[PDB]
């Protein structure tokens with residue numbers, strides 16, 4: 001098997017048959033009696049002799065260590081820093097069970113503070129963040145300062161799966177990717193699945209030598225599943241991508257919001273680098289708190305936007321009761337509805353007359369739009385972020401208005417309060433350098449940030465920022481309020 | 494102050510001037526240089542001699558201990574320090590805080606780790622996927638783990654009264670499950686302290702109170718013991734516990750929206766106090782309980798609101814195919830009882846009554862409708878005390894004590910009405926009415942029997958209050974019905 005751009009979307013990266021050289025790996029049977037597999041560098045690091053497969057775990061590791069590892073197993077992978085081996089030495093061991101196999105991963109110990117102490121220091125620096133913007137800004141600076149990586153970013157996954165760089169702390173000499181996007185294909189489903197499963201993903205050396213697991217394919221033809229093994233080797237594609245950037249190493253912290261991958265906190269370094277296990281425990285704890293605090297802020301934000309909308313629509317209902325002419329009130333008031341949700345324009349289409357405000361289509365194109373919604377909707381809110389896919393003629397004005405949300409004012413007449421958004425590329429706040437070129441490998445320019453961003457621009461060409469579930473809930477509240485205004489008007493007139 | 498039944502609602506329980514005998518207390522100045530106050534038992538427990546006041550902290554505690562405590566004081570809640578050294582080779586569990594201008598140090602003799610015990614308890618409640626399940630697990634779990642004779646959970650009602658919503662007890666004890674106590678049984682100052690402190694400890698309800706020397710200092714100021722866990726108990730509550738047979742207790746406060754949702758109350762029928770490490774764990778457990786309770790409450794609310802929308806959305810689609818909207822409502826009104834908790838429901842349209850479940854008789858509906866027309870401003874009107882608004886409603890208060898009214902029109906006085914029974918009719922009380930209690934000098938007021946009777950009087954002729962969630966559902970329904978009438982006007 002030879003990974004390339006044709007088949008890399010289905011690469012079995014969970015069973016590479018190699019590990020990274022910053023530790024060694026031993027795979028035992030389910031009960032941890034027999035050594036079934038081992039990495040080739042086990043002899044170097046653990047100071048072991050000849051061939052490990054066939055020997056008992058007690059023989060290889062000692063009675064005392066096996067006893068202790070069986071205890072941690074009984075009580076995600078179990079993280080055991082500063083374990084004492086048979087010789088006069090200390091090792092950071094991680095331990096888990098998946099499929100039938102028990103995988104044991106080893107790292108030379110160092111001198112580290114307690115994980116809980118380090119995590120607690122970090123968490124205390126983001127508790128007082130009272131908005132999502134504040135939290136997202138703090139975290140990249142704080143993580144860079146605590147972990148000591150050259151760049152730290154936060155990606156937020158969009159509705160189509162693309163990633164958006166929403167925060168960045170970098171070395172001053174590096175180029176920026178803040179406000180940049182990458183398309184969904186840059187992270188394949190299998191990689192996303194492992195980001196969802198594992199909190200941390202470590203890469204020590206993008207140009208490092210892959211240490212083989214022996215055997216790669218066992219007596220029965222089965223490969224070793226390394227899904228939860230933190231020493232699992234990296235795809236040649238992503239390694240080439242990192243090399244083209246000049247990145248030698250990385251660590252990701254996954255952000256889990258609704259049991260789903262909201263994004264990543266991505267730490268990159270421009271020379272080989274790995275954190276010790278105790279600092280990785282703390283990073284995992286910090287990631288957990290970051291995700292919870294983000295979720296609280298995100299709800300508070302949502303609740304405040306919905307309540308704002310209700311308060312505005314409530315005020316509008318009371319004003320409207322004192323008006324004999326409802327069409328006139330809307331002609332004067334419609335632009336105030338733009339305040340209810342993010343939009344670049346709003347307009348009123350009543351009795352074949354157009355009144356616009358902000359970035360809208362020209363008045364010639366509105367009849368076509370209103371006619372489409374009349375056929376497409378069943379008398380409730382219709383919305384899209386890709387007008388050209390629905391109405392080919394809309395491509396002409398896509399720069400000014402690529403998306404549309406229509407609120408019906410009547411089930412009899414073809415009247416609408418319309419909301420609009422610009423082409424998403426028009427609202428780019430990219431802080432990067434367009435003259436930054438990139439080195440390439442055998443795969444070519446595909447594996448560079450320049451070409452990734454350009455591919456993303458193509459994926460969203462003639463499209464706007466999608467209408468969120470929150471926006472649609474506000475739209476429904478607005479429709480409902482206007483039905484109420486019309487009915488109370490009918491009652492008294 | 495000599496507290497009694499006349500004035501116990503305003504008792505300054507934050508400044509009793511005494512502590513409980515299971516530890517000793519030392520009060521220092523703001524910078525922890527000088528000893529200003531000390532409890533009378535400090536000599537016994539700490540092995541010190543003479544009047545401790547006027548001596549330096551360095552003198553009384555030694556140079557090392559003072560240095561270590563000053564470091565802890567830099568680390569907003571009492572610092573808990575288990576297994577601390579005094580240089581006799583004596584271990585003490587020390588709690589430490591600053592409040593007002595006073596540093597308070599509290600000592601207990603020492604005797605597993607907190608994170609391990611809390612961890613085991615939390616794992617036993619993580620998988621609860623309903624408020625009912627969490628509440629039921631927790632009393633059994635806490636009882637088994639902390640070894641108390643009874644564990645209860647109270648949920649505070651909107652009027653301040655507490656309801657016993659869960660219970661784990663010794664089999665020979667009486668049950669208080671499904672019982673209520675009135676707001677007056679926990680005064681505002683006690684509530685404020687329950688909100689401020691996660692744990693409240695009572696080692697001995699018949700134990701002798703150790704005075705704090707001095708109770709009133711040269712300046713005339715008392716010692717504020719609001720965050721001191723050794724703070725002594727009111728004589729009123731001690732008498733209350735003695736009447737029950739309870740000798741000791743530990744409360745864990747449940748905080749939901751920065752507000753006292755309830756307590757996890759542990760009672761014991763002989764003296765009892767948990768060591769500091771176990772109390773740390775209980776505090777950690779209480780924190781998780783509160784968070785997990787909050788997550789389940791939101792899920793429960795979200796599901797009820799979405800259910801209501803799905804029903805109302807279905808009703809809108811069906812109504813589009815009906816030429817007669819009055820007829821549709823006459824056939825469908827009883828289905829609206831599924832939207833929110835209620836004991837009855839009825840339609841009042843064109844001076845015609847159609848009822849279902851526990852409602853007032855048709856005779857009384859004109860009076861009720863007329864009152865809502867005058868009281869409301871065209872939106873949802875609701876009460877849980879009909880007698881207070883309409884005296885004549887006392888006649889049918891047994892059947893219908895609370896009402897929620899949804900206006901169907903601003904021209905006509907038409908309504909969809911929702912009813913609830915007298916709250917005493919829906920009691921599910923598992924206790925024994927034949928269980929009597931002994932009394933002290935204050936009398937039978939300080940007994941569970943009289944408390945429950947007092948609560949019954951406070952809610953007489955009233956129903957379960959209409960919650961903010963019930964009101965949101967009502968507003969969704971009103972709005973839905975307006976849209977039905979409007980779309981009906983459009984095509985007819």
Ligand SMILES: *C/C=C1/C(=C/C2=NC(=C\c3[nH]c(/C=C4/NC(=O)C(C=C)=C4C)c(C)c3CCC(=O)O)/C(CCC(=O)O)=C2C)NC(=O)[C@H]1C
Nearest residue numbers: 008009177182185186187188191234235237238266449452
């Ligand atoms: C056909 C397969 C491709 C592919 C596979 C993998 N990508 C993995 C990681 C990865 N890739 C990116 C993409 C980026 N796009 C950018 O524009 C950009 C910077 C400007 C980056 C860094 C990201 C963000 C990630 C993960 C997060 C991170 O490290 O920052 C990956 C997993 C690697 C692993 O095993 O750890 C695989 C496999 N990437 C492709 O582009 C295509 C062709």
Ligand SMILES: *C/C=C1/C(=C/C2=NC(=C\c3[nH]c(/C=C4/NC(=O)C(C=C)=C4C)c(C)c3CCC(=O)O)/C(CCC(=O)O)=C2C)NC(=O)[C@H]1C
Nearest residue numbers: 501502669674677678679680683726727730742758941944
């Ligand atoms: C005029 C003042 C009164 C008063 C004061 C205090 N009550 C405190 C605690 C307390 N009291 C109760 C009431 C109960 N009513 C019951 O029916 C009942 C059993 C079925 C009980 C236990 C409760 C629930 C509590 C909470 C503590 C616990 O559950 O153990 C209190 C604070 C004591 C302290 O310092 O810790 C004060 C002060 N209680 C009265 O009844 C009146 C008259």
